[PDB]
Write the C-alpha cells for this entry.
Amino acid sequence: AAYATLITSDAYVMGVEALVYSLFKARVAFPLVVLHSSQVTQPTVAKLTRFCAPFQSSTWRISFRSVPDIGISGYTKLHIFAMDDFEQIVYIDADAIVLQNVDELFDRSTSFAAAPDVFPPDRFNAGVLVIRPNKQLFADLLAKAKELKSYDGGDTGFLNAFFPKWFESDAASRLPFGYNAQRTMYWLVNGKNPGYWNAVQPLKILHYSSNPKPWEDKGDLEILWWQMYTESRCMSFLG
Amino acid sequence: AAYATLITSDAYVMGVEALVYSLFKARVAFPLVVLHSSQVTQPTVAKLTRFCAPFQSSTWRISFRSVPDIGISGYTKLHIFAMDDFEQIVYIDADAIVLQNVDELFDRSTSFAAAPDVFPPDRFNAGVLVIRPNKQLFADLLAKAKELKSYDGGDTGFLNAFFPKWFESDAASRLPFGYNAQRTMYWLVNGKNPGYWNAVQPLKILHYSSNPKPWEDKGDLEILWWQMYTESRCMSFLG
Ligand SMILES: O=c1ccn([C@@H]2O[C@H](COP(=O)(O)OP(=O)(O)O)[C@@H](O)[C@H]2O)c(=O)[nH]1
Ligand SMILES: O=c1ccn([C@@H]2O[C@H](COP(=O)(O)OP(=O)(O)O)[C@@H](O)[C@H]2O)c(=O)[nH]1
Ligand SMILES: [Pt+2]
Ligand SMILES: [Pt+2]
C-alpha cells in the first residue's frame, strides 16, 4: 500500500512539497510515491528529491517514478491504475494538504473510492482516489478515453463518465467530504453561511481546487496553505 | 401511498398551486395531501381548494389536512412522519415543481430517503423526502428537537443531526440530485460552467430554494417557474 501524488509541471513543485510535509506531520504509516511526467524538467525533480531527503527514514520512504504524459497531459493521473506492484493506492492531488492522519483510508475494502464533488453533489471529485491497481482496468480507461466526453473538460469529468453509477455504490466507495474538502465551497459559503463549512467534521484533507493555486498568489484557507509550506521549508532546510 | 406538500403561510399559496399543477401534468398515479398549518387563514385554504377542484377526478384525489404548527413553525414539516394512515409518503416542498413523473420514488424499499444538498454534498436537503410514517419515530423527532441544534437553523439542519449517517446509507435512501435539483447550484455555475448543471440527468424535480421565491419577484429557471404557474391558472380557470 502507498500514498501517491502527481506532478506534471515544474510550477506545482511547491504543492508537492506542502503535501509531502503534511503527510510527514500526520505520521502516515505507508510510503509515498511521487509520479512525475515528462514535462517536469530534471532539475525540478532533483530539487524535489533534495527537499524530501530530510524526511526519509528507516520507517518512511518517499520514492520517485517517471511516468509518460497522457493527453486528450490531462489524463496523466490514470497511471495510478497501472501501479500494480501495490495492492492499494491512496492518490492525492498535489494541490491538497493532509491535516490529520488518513491511514484508515486503506481499511476500505473496495477497488475504487472517491469523495463527492460539490457540483453536482452526486458526482465525485477526482482529487482523492482510493484504488486497487489493475493493468486491465488501466488498458480500458486508456481505450475509453478516446470515446467518452467529460462534462468538466478534465479527468474528473472523464472518470465520472467511466463510473456513472458511483453515487449508487456502497459506503466503502463513497468517501465523506472531509477526505476531499474543496475550498470552492468555503469560498462560496464563508461570508454568508460559515456553519455549512464547520459541519464538515472531521476535516482531514483540504483540497485547493480551482484557481489561482495558493503558490500562484490571501484568504483564511490560503493562509493555512502558506503556514504548511513555509514550515516545510524550515524543517527541510534547518531541521 | 401519497404525495404530500405543506403550506404554513398564505404567501406560499402560489408555490402550492404551481406544484399541484405540475403533479397533474406529470400524471402521477398517487393522490396528494396538502398539509396546511394554523397560520394559513381559511380564505387562502378555500381559494386553494377552489384552484384544485378542476384537477379532481375519479382517478386522482387532492385532499387537505389541517396540522398544528411546530416551532423551535420551522419544524411543521415533521408532521409527515405521523401521517400513518399511509404506508409511504413522497413529500415535496411547496417551492418545487415536478417536471417529469416521479411515481418510481414509491418503489424504493426504505423508510427514509432524501437527496444530497450541495453544501456540504454529504448531507441531505430536506425539500424532497420519501418516508414511511411511524408515530413512534415522530414522537422521538418531537423530543429530540428540544436537544439537537441545526447547522443551518432549519429543518434540514435538524434532520441531518437526527440522521447523521445518511451519506453511509444504501442507495435506496440516497436519491439522485435530479430528484431535488436546487436552483442555488444553477445560480452559481450557469454563467461560468453550465455543463455542471446539464450533467444532472434526468432532471425530474426542480427546487426553488433560497430567496427570493419566484412568486416574491427573472432568470431562466424563474421563467420556467412562471411558465408552470401561469399555465396552471389558465387550466384552472378556463380549462
Ligand atoms: O499544471 C498542472 C496541472 C495538474 N497537475 C497535477 O494534476 C493534479 C490535478 O490538477 P488540478 O489539481 O490543478 O485540478 P483541479 O483540482 O483544480 O480541478 C494536480 O493537483 C497535480 O497533481 C500538475 O502537476 N500541474
Ligand atoms: O414561509 C413559509 C416557509 C415555509 N413554508 C413551507 O415549508 C417549506 C420549506 O421552506 P422553504 O422551501 O422556503 O425553505 P428552503 O427550501 O429555501 O430552505 C416550503 O417549501 C413550504 O412548503 C411555507 O409554506 N411558508
Ligand atoms: Pt486539485
Ligand atoms: Pt424549499
